[PDB]
Amino acid sequence: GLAVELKQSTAQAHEKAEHSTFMSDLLKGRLGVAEFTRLQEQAWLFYTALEQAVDAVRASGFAESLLDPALNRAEVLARDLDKLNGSSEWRSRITASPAVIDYVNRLEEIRDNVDGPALVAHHYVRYLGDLSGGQVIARMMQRHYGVDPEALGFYHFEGIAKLKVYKDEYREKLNNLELSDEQREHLLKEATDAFVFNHQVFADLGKGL
Amino acid sequence: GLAVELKQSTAQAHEKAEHSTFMSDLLKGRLGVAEFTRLQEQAWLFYTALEQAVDAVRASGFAESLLDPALNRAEVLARDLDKLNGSSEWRSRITASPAVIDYVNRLEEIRDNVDGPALVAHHYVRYLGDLSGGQVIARMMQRHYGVDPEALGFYHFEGIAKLKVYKDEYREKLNNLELSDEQREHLLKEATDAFVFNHQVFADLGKGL
């Protein structure tokens, strides 16, 4: 089963990303809404790239059922940022941190190579993470930083009626993907790389705080 | 209800804040008018910030009955400082201690995010403290150090006829404030933070910072 192997294969990189100082301080309430907003601005950049890659791979006819467009976060995130920032002009200010430049560059490579297995790896890391831990992070942003729940649209999946069921079905879709050994190994390696990119995103965010 | 939970949730932080060496020394007469004046100068900086946040949250329509304008201290405090310092010199002289920088930063962030639950937390900690502990302070500054009550206007609430009734009604408003679970959690979290900020202001004063 691919879902189980992905979990085990990526365990070290996953633990390290999740326990970054930035995320750890954020979730304990030691930072502020500013840092949460900076996180979401960087996320808007890499979700934009991710979803271009998703679009390409879906259009190619690869992993169609897994690549549910209901999962798209980029536009929802832009609306969150309009609220957090109070104006629509964050768009001109923000620029990718060095880790985000690297992450986006890989996602664009995946888009242009229409690399289905590598895309699936990235999709798992971001969206299964969002589905799994999203309510936790959302609850924390309200509890610690008083964030308006209307500015946490990112953590809400409209039209997914029941997250439990969805996550279970997502893992089954992973299990049911037809992959050669070469593709599966490519996917697995990429999933660790994707956790690593995210770790470095947090490291950039926490620098000099 | 909330007033009781608030007292209970903040008990450890409150006790630590109340037992600072600086305040202990000041209140039992080991210090002097100079130290009391340094306190009030730092207080003017954070009341100025606090009252900007209060004005923002009141304008927004949140907790209106709690945010009684009669509580405003900044202008009264500036006059006390004119008397303590003998002129307006203090205005261009004073600077925020590292602790007061952090405290003012928080108050400005509450103002910018118009964070009503957070503001109520800070409002309780300062004003309900003034209507209780501050009353002892005013008596002791006069008795221990011969401070003229003319320079203790900060501790007199001209708009408030009966402190006992006022405090009881304040707590009943707290009990009747409509809050989501998340807002309530946020208010409780901020209230502990507010006591810690104040403890750190006293630590800096004691360190001559």
Curated annotation (Swiss-Prot), chains A, B:
It is an enzyme of class 1 (oxidoreductase). The gene is hmuO. Its EC number is 1.14.14.18. One of its GO terms (biological process) is heme catabolic process. Pfam families: Heme_oxygenase. It catalyses: heme b + 3 reduced [NADPH--hemoprotein reductase] + 3 O2 = biliverdin IXalpha + CO + Fe(2+) + 3 oxidized [NADPH--hemoprotein reductase] + 3 H2O + H(+). PROSITE patterns: HEME_OXYGENASE. Transmembrane segments: none annotated. Gene3D superfamilies: Heme oxygenase-like. It comes from Corynebacterium diphtheriae (strain ATCC 700971 / NCTC 13129 / Biotype gravis). This is Heme oxygenase. It comes from the Bacteria. Belongs to the heme oxygenase family. CDD domains: HemeO. Keywords: Heme, Iron, Metal-binding, Oxidoreductase. GO terms for molecular function: heme binding; heme oxygenase (decyclizing) activity; metal ion binding. Heme b binds at residue 14. Allows the bacteria to use the host heme as an iron source. Involved in the oxidation of heme and subsequent release of iron from the heme moiety.
